[PDB]
């Protein structure tokens, strides 16, 4: 008919004849095509899908059911392809499955559907619902998996991976992550993992970390990655600061003589997700007092207005032992070197001696005692190997290991589920704060609101960081009934008012 | 009758119908008098009630004050105000709802305004996000009140903003200055909207506390702030080696 109209009629009526033919050939038979649409999508016949897409572009209202069928099929395919996975490669396999589904339904949406943008939005919405598949009465398992995938990729692993391979796989990760709708939890998980990798030196290359921070920056703006960028920059300028400190101690009039190789890794405490969890006081050992005092002097005379907090929660130092014929050197946590300098006074010690020498609390002391006891670097002389009120134990002369640099530090990664739920609780607390703020700013703007209108407005405004489910908004509203400005109206139960 | 009220304030509960029946029996007796139908109620169960509940809450506040700190005090007091509102509608006439609560406030938060305002500075400095909310409510319905917290928080944001400007590094002072103010403004517009709420007395207490920060010059000097915002505004527009796109600039 296109040939016929172009060979007889005037050119100005090409559109009207073709549209009218489609207004009777396809639009009148819309019900039959829409009935077979779901079956055609489910079998995924590419030629029939293309022909159906053309014939429903012809009809004014035939397209949206095709869109809905494609979205439902893609959501079903993704949810079947990602739910059942092994528990040892779940972080890699989840992103791999979501990326595979996305690649298949970008190819099959760009080669037989002309890359129609409504269908791409349907794909985006379907995989958005796929990735955040919350188990009923359970928290979402997406952002933990994505953060663990990035920590697995970026850390210096013994599997061996090409740097450019890491680059393109992280680009694919960004394509997966662009729809996760829980970016706050992912942000803080990745902040903690980035902190651990940066501090412990487990990053494979700082350039890869910079690339990852940049990719998240184009993914979610600059305020999403401001803290991460500050972390990376304050880890990168650590070398310059340490060289400046060495130039300072060179320029001192008297001989400084620290005696210890010193690199300090100062971190911006206003942006690093580290915490001063060991609030119990710790005592710096004797020979390290000169180093701490000299670094404070450097940081106060060459630089101004900032107070250090020697957190000691994750410090390391290489103690050399020279009683068994100088056998080995052990890199330990600073509490472990504290108890080792306690051992330096005499072979046998006591519990109260350990508190009057190191001032630490009982939990960290128990942890270090267990760490040294499992290594058997220091044997325990009492009957029971647990925490003891006296804790009378001497040096272990039976230590006959083989590695010249064996450590009593195995907390390189850890990340216990207690820590994961603690970070989840902290993110939920910040979500409560932000959600209360959004609720009350909307209310103060309106001063009278229906309940559902307030829910919709809050979900719309707080969309910039996540999509809070109605449970959180109801919890925040019930909190704001007690605290501060909101009250149930007397006219109805869904007429919240500003007080 | 007042002993039944005091028994209710002690923790137990008398007959809800009988107590309200006889208090509402001081109205409904003078119902037919045209001028001042509540005149009998205003002189037999208003002055003997407000004086008694004023006396009862004059010493109950002193019991709680001397038995707990300021943090627990505002939990009990705001608990009592919520509780006394229920015990006012359960028994009394609806025309005396405001007077009992106002009498409860004026002897539980207005008699101890000297104590509360001495703890106003310590709560904001530690940035407690809970007691600072409870202090706002107890200092909301009382006129002598909140303008001390207005000046206290204005003396705290400016104190936090000052530490975001002084001792700031010259290496990247354009970006680091504007971010630090935005970090201070960003945190303290959410905290003033959640622990406190949107209150033009308090929102202006941020601006007055921040205009003394984005204009803070050391004595006898040119104000460094306008060029610090000018240099920063140039770096975003000027072609930088970082190569940030238009999306991260706009």
């Amino acid at each position: 008919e296109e040939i016929r109209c172009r060979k007889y009629l005037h050119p100005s009526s090409y559109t009207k004849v073709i549209h009218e033919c489609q207004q009777r050939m396809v639009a009148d038979h819309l019900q039959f095509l829409h009935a077979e649409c779901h079956n055609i999508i489910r079998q995924e016949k590419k030629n029939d899908m293309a022909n159906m897409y053309v014939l429903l572009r012809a009809v004014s209202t035939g397209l949206p059911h095709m869109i809905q069928e494609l979205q439902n099929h893609i959501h079903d395919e993704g949810l079947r392809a990602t739910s059942n996975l092994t528990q040892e490669n779940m972080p890699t396999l989840f992103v791999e499955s979501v990326l595979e589904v996305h690649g298949k339904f970008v190819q099959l949406i760009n080669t037989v559907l002309n890359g129609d943008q409504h269908f791409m939005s349907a794909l985006d919405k379907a995989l958005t619902s796929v990735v955040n598949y919350r188990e009923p009465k359970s928290v979402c398992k997406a952002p933990e998996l994505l953060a663990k995938y990035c920590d697995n990729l970026l850390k210096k692993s013994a599997k061996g991976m090409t740097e450019n391979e890491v680059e393109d796989r992280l680009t694919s990760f960004i394509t997966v992550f662009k729809y996760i709708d829980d970016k706050d939890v992912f942000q803080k998980f990745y902040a903690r993992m980035l902190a651990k990798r940066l501090i412990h030196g487990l990053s494979m290359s700082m350039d890869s970390e910079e690339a990852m921070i940049n990719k998240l920056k184009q993914a979610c703006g600059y305020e999403f990655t401001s803290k991460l960028h500050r972390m990376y920059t304050d880890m990168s300028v650590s070398a310059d600061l340490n060289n400046k400190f060495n130039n300072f101690i060179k320029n001192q009039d008297t001989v400084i003589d620290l005696g210890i190789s010193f690199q300090i890794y100062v971190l911006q405490a206003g942006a690093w997700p580290l915490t001063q969890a060991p609030s119990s006081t710790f005592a710096i050992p004797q020979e390290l007092e000169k180093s701490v005092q000299m670094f404070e002097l450097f940081y106060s005379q060459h630089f101004s207005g900032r107070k250090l907090t020697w957190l000691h929660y994750l410090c390391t130092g290489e103690v050399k032992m020279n009683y068994l014929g100088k056998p080995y050197v052990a890199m330990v946590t600073t509490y472990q070197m504290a108890v080792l300098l306690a051992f330096n006074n005499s072979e046998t010690v006591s519990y109260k001696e350990l508190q009057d020498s190191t001032q630490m609390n009982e939990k960290e002391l128990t942890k270090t005692i267990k760490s040294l006891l499992d290594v058997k670097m220091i044997n325990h002389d009492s009957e029971k190997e647990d925490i003891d009120a006296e804790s009378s134990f001497s040096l272990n002369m039976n230590f006959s290991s083989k590695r010249t640099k064996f450590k009593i530090t195995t907390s390189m990664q850890k990340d216990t589920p207690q820590e994961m739920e603690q970070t989840r609780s902290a993110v939920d607390e910040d979500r409560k704060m932000y959600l209360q703020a959004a609720i009350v700013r909307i209310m103060k703007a309106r001063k009278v609101l229906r309940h559902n209108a307030l829910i919709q407005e809050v979900i719309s405004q707080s969309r910039a960081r996540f999509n809070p489910s109605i449970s959180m908004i109801k919890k925040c509203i019930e909190v704001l009934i007690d605290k501060q400005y909101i009250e149930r109206s007397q006219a109805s139960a869904d007429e919240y008012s500003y007080v | 009758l007042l002993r039944e009220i005091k028994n209710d304030r002690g923790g137990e509960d008398p007959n809800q119908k009988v107590i309200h029946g006889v208090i509402n029996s001081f109205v409904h007796v003078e119902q037919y008098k045209k001028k001042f139908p509540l005149k009998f109620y205003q002189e037999i169960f208003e002055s003997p009630f407000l004086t008694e509940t004023g006396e009862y809450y004059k010493q109950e506040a002193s019991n709680l004050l001397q038995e707990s700190n300021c943090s627990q005090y505002m939990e009990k007091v705001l608990g009592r105000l919520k509780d006394e509102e229920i015990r006012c509608r359960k028994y009394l006439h609806p025309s005396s709802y405001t007077k009992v609560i106002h009498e409860c406030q004026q002897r539980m938060v207005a008699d101890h305004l000297q104590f509360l305002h001495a703890e106003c500075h310590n709560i904001i400095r530690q940035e407690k996000k809970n007691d600072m909310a409870n202090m706002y409510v107890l200092l909301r319905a009382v006129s002598t009140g909140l303008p001390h917290m207005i000046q206290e928080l204005q003396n705290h944001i400016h104190d936090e903003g000052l530490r975001a400007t002084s001792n700031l590094t010259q290496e990247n002072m354009p970006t680091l200055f504007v971010e630090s103010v935005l970090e201070v403004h960003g945190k303290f517009v959410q905290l003033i909207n959640t622990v406190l709420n949107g209150d033009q007395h308090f929102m202006s207490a941020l601006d007055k506390a921040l205009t003394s920060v984005v204009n803070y010059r050391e004595p006898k000097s040119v104000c460094k702030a306008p060029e610090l915002l000018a240099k920063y505004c140039d770096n975003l527009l000027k072609k930088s080696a970082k190569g940030m796109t238009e999306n991260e600039v706009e």
Binding site: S261, I264, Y265, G270, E287, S291, Y299, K307, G317, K320 | -
Partner: peptide
């Protein structure tokens, strides 16, 4: 006898109280 070397200490800085 115990002696230490290579202290890879970590510290946090924050704006001073004043």
């Amino acid at each position: 006898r115990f002696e230490v070397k290579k202290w890879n200490a970590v510290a946090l800085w924050a704006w001073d109280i004043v």
